[PDB]
Design a protein around this ligand. Structure first.
Ligand SMILES: CN(C)Cc1cc(O)ccc1Br
Length: 209
């Protein structure tokens, strides 16, 4: 069972601005996704402070970076609070309608695309380097769902029968053919050190055979 939804107009517009605007500093995507994972890890740590059993689905709070050269995917895994189905449909838990409005007004007033995270829609920077994005997520109060979009004005949501995650969120970036540099160990490591060096969670860069 696969449901297909239209993006709100303002979100589709933000997505095509990100895809079409000439802008060379594409590496900020990794900082924005990592920062979103860190925010979701803060959220489940804070709930665990008064209710320990919110960690029965995973005591470990971490972020993993997993490049796969055969599939041409970069996967960002976190064991944060995760997302309910309604969250996924509602622009992946963001206020994307009003953040895009403020983001685009800023762009006309001195801002550049690298400031997208200040307006809450940093996730969509994923499309600076990905032609398709898949978000697997599991929240304590809901089942495991798969969100998927290749832009073009729509996204799908389905129940994910893949590997149980326990709790957290997985962003699979199907990279564009000319963005494979973000699969290389030394290039990911440079970006993490440049932009994410004070994230309060361990970031493990997986290696490949
Ligand atoms: C924005 N990237 C990292 C996906 C994501 C992770 C979360 O932990 C929560 C929401 C989203 Br979308």
């Amino acid at each position: 069972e696969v449901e297909t939804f239209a993006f709100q107009a303002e979100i589709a517009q933000l997505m095509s601005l990100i895809i079409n605007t000439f802008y060379s500093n594409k590496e900020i995507f990794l900082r924005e996704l990592i920062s979103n994972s860190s925010d979701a890890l803060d959220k489940i740590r804070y709930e665990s402070l008064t209710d320990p059993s919110k960690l029965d689905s995973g005591k470990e709070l971490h972020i993993n970076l997993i490049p796969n050269k055969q599939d041409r995917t970069l996967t960002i895994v976190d064991t944060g609070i995760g997302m309910t189905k309604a969250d996924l449909i509602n622009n992946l838990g963001t206020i994307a309608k009003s953040g895009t409005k403020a983001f685009m007004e800023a762009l006309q007033a001195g801002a550049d695309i690298s400031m997208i995270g200040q307006f809450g829609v940093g996730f969509y920077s994923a499309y600076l380097v990905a032609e398709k994005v898949t978000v697997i997520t599991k929240h304590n109060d809901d089942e495991q769902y798969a969100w998927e979009s290749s832009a073009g004005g729509s996204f799908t949501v389905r129940t994910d029968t893949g590997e149980p995650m326990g709790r957290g969120t997985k962003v699979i970036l199907h990279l564009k053919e000319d963005q494979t540099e973000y699969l290389e160990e030394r290039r990911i490591k440079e970006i993490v050190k440049k932009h994410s060096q004070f994230i309060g969670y361990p970031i493990t860069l997986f290696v490949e055979k």
